[PDB]
């Protein structure tokens, strides 16, 4: 009854969620603990029915019971050669036993007899026997100790569960009517309420003072507590003089009406908590392979989701709200935007009742009361952040043993990921084992608290990324964990991270909602696009202006100094006289704040800089955290603090400082930074991140030059388009260098970044890029104010009007406006000395890098490909006329920070790049008619969750498979200066690159014996899309990369002075009707078709050959002749034929026969599945001397202790040839005999034969030493 004899029907496999296939067992008894599975099919989970009656849980238990009788799993133990020894299958173990311990808790063990067994099965055996082992980790200090990760059989078959139980968040109704993306979207802008105009903010009365002006006085925001239990004496922030459009029923966000067939998680956090079998379990076990009783159980601990949820910030109990409170609530609410910092509507995966609470109602604070001064008071909530099935299992995987603790960092979330869901690891789980691992304690800490100490100096690449938080942890980082590994002596956590929300940071002017549909949908939670969409016309000058100040200038005529359509040209100067009169004239107090009449405004960069959760030099510094990203939008690797992780307490105690104010009066005088009270401990968790990386070690404009240098996986063509002829030759997508015209440097705008003390040995002259604004071809050194916003009733803004002028004490009334403004306001604008005019930003640059490697950056489409809607490049695209409409720069609706036409060219949408016959797909900036456009995908289906397992390459480098690219971090551990610090190896198998679910061909990455990292690919294992409904329908098809891009509609572009002013849109709610042709291409398959792809390998992909000098871009970083960004563009261009020299290249491939399921890795070998494990040729001549052949007299008569060095525990060099048979003329020094056990009394000498491996000069066990193993006992004729 060899209960755990190797079952040949089982074969290795890799779990999708973590990419574990085998654990490399180190130490005295090396080998591997590899996952192993039954490969029976014809399972129909369809057989298990749901009789409406009882619930999801009732259905699940039934599925697990079904699968219990169908599927089979174990973890088999392999010897150092790769040969299987024993299986250990929990379901088929009849008599499982816990290990016997001492009084100290130390297990009872003899190296030969094995473990002492209690004969009692481990705790909760009946629930846990049926669970599937998905990960094995070995204790570093304690020997024979290992840890198994168990998940329900259901967690595996998650995607195959009933369509009505496991569904997508995007409702697709069975209608063959017509496709309108905006149909689900709330697009009707708010209107003036009339009911109460007493809710409109008041001007200040009065106040010698030198400067004065006729400009409309500041608006006072007064807040006074008074003596009332439920009411405030004054509460101006609550004042809402606007209201939702009334279509005989309000145009507002209602979860009841909108989510009729609402997305809900498989199980609530409490269900997973209660139902022992439905959760992940970690079982501590013992293992000595060459011993008799070789397997024994230890400690069985269930990973309670409630243990993580307990340690969430108190901010998270009320996530439909934020520290800004009621002013921001009404403002977002009215603007048909999601409220809070983590709204169910945006991320329902984390809410127990999913989409059911997907609105702004009941935020935990009184809102919309009949009397506004009763608003903003703490009321009852029913919408906290939790950890449902979906998000929970996404956080199950990647476990590491550090000292007396075991940590679970989570997986890539693929186990529960749907096309419209983003389940991710919210934090770390830790089982703290005590008393020789006889006692345990389970706890969970969210990443948000562990990452609180994040500051710019920790990174060496892009700076000011939205990863900052505050006392109320409003930034909620989540991960698609690659792994946690030791890179040398440093603990690295890698994968992809969810940055702060950057694309919804700007806020619209209450009327501009229907013109800016794409942007509205991003705030609405409908368009799950994390990238910044460039639709700036409609933006309000500031996102922080309260509703009371929105109707000071309704007609617009006054250019409302308070609230107006964001335009950096009509912004005020920083001259003392301007500031003195418009700002310092009004002074804020204890009970008063002012809506200043100083004209503030700026583009993307500026809006983000002031209202995003940017990183600074101080932690918990973000006064503004807009929201959190939908999908992981950043590459991320971080050196963690082992001592903190192991040291930190289980329960984290927050203080009143982590809680939102109980009323708008307390809230009014909130200090952003508060000192933790001595009874709390929350503060101690903030600095677990010592350092971090986010990609290559480049910043701002310099970074863009690299973005171009890298190619697109689908094409093999770079974003640069630099290889060539003609003067109408394609321009780069990300760079500004040699694009447009070279403008001249002067006019530093704010923060007194003056200098001028040290002038460089060159002219710094900045290129405008594409979509620039020039006075004349001759005059390209600034733009006179005369190319001004002439907005209301075509009556231009007059800069010298009484209100737009200030006069100091003495006279001569001068205007507040600027005389000249920068030569670009396009998405590709990069003005170093004009933040307010810059659109290009690091938060976008970061996303763009991840997204260019995933190759999923969207393109704006005007003309489809169809016979009557074409784009003839030769005629409609003039690369030299970027200044005009012939440059086809949208200037509205495109991805911010890039030139759409160059991206389209790169993608081969128009041109020979992808299709040999020009697909003629593009954007025509038309001077004859109103333009109707929509963003579309590239045609690739890679997601930012397509994160493979972590591979340590050496004591200073590591990497992982991110989509089709294998990224390696060379300059993270010991960062070499002048080196870029990234190596990218692209996949070659096109059938995978373009595939519908491409990451389903991925079967893990592994570092090979040769030294290079390799990745398993199996295109036969590519999962096809859900089902060919009808013939194959007639509407949109949800794919992993599928997005719900809304139509943008702009007026006809000008023939001359096109991008002098911002591009003006018009209503587009209706516009979908004619885009039938284009709207068709919102579905991946259709673009794949037009590009000549989709319809018609299998092996291992090795990375590019890198050397110590590889990555040395120092020559390109020199600021000798040109500014850093220019010198790098020149350098990259010179190195275009040898991209390999930098670290960019095509990963070489080796063909393999049959389906690849995983690898079995022992310190000696990596065998794909169980490829030919052979006996070691080096040791084949070494063997123990048979019992009879022993001398007996020589020092075996006298005590055993005399045969080995007590300090070292090795048999003295002299007796070694007495016990082992060696080939004639063998080096005695290349073999050793460790004493495993001895009995002076019983005259027994237990040994293990070790041999110095010729490759690594370490001793390996001579597995062929005995019939049993490298172990044997020597005893006199007994």
Numbering used by the authors: 56 to 262, 266 to 782, 787 to 1158, 1166 to 1347
What does the paper say about this structure?
This complex is formed by two heterodimers, each consisting of proteins P110 and P1401–6. In addition to their roles in cytadherence and motility, P110 and P140 are immunodominant proteins and constitute the main target of host antibodies during infection. Here, we address the structure and mechanism of the Nap adhesion complex and reveal an intricate interplay between P110 and P140.
Crystals were obtained from the extracellular region of P140 (residues 23–1351), both alone and in complex with the N-terminal domain of P110 (P110N: residues 23–827). The structure of P140, for which there are no molecular models or experimental phases available, was determined by density modification techniques, starting with a mask derived from the sub-tomogram-averaged map of the whole Nap obtained by cryo-electron tomography (cryo-ET). The structure of the extracellular region of P140, with a bulky N-terminal domain (residues 23–1243) and a small C-terminal domain (residues 1244–1351), has an overall shape resembling the capital letter P. The N-terminal domain consists of a seven-bladed (β-sheet) propeller and a “crown” formed by the clustering of the long polypeptide segments that emerge from the propeller. β-Sheets I to VI each have four strands, while β-sheet VII, the last β-sheet in the propeller that connects directly with the C-terminal domain, has only two strands. P140 and P110 share many features of domain organization and the topology of the secondary structural elements, suggesting a common ancestor, although the degree of conservation differs for the N-terminal and C-terminal domains. The N-terminal domains, with an RMSD of 3.5 Å between the Cα atoms of 359 structurally equivalent residues (∼28%), are markedly different in the crown. In contrast, the C-terminal domains are closely related, with 74 equivalent residues (∼71%) and an RMSD of 2.2 Å.
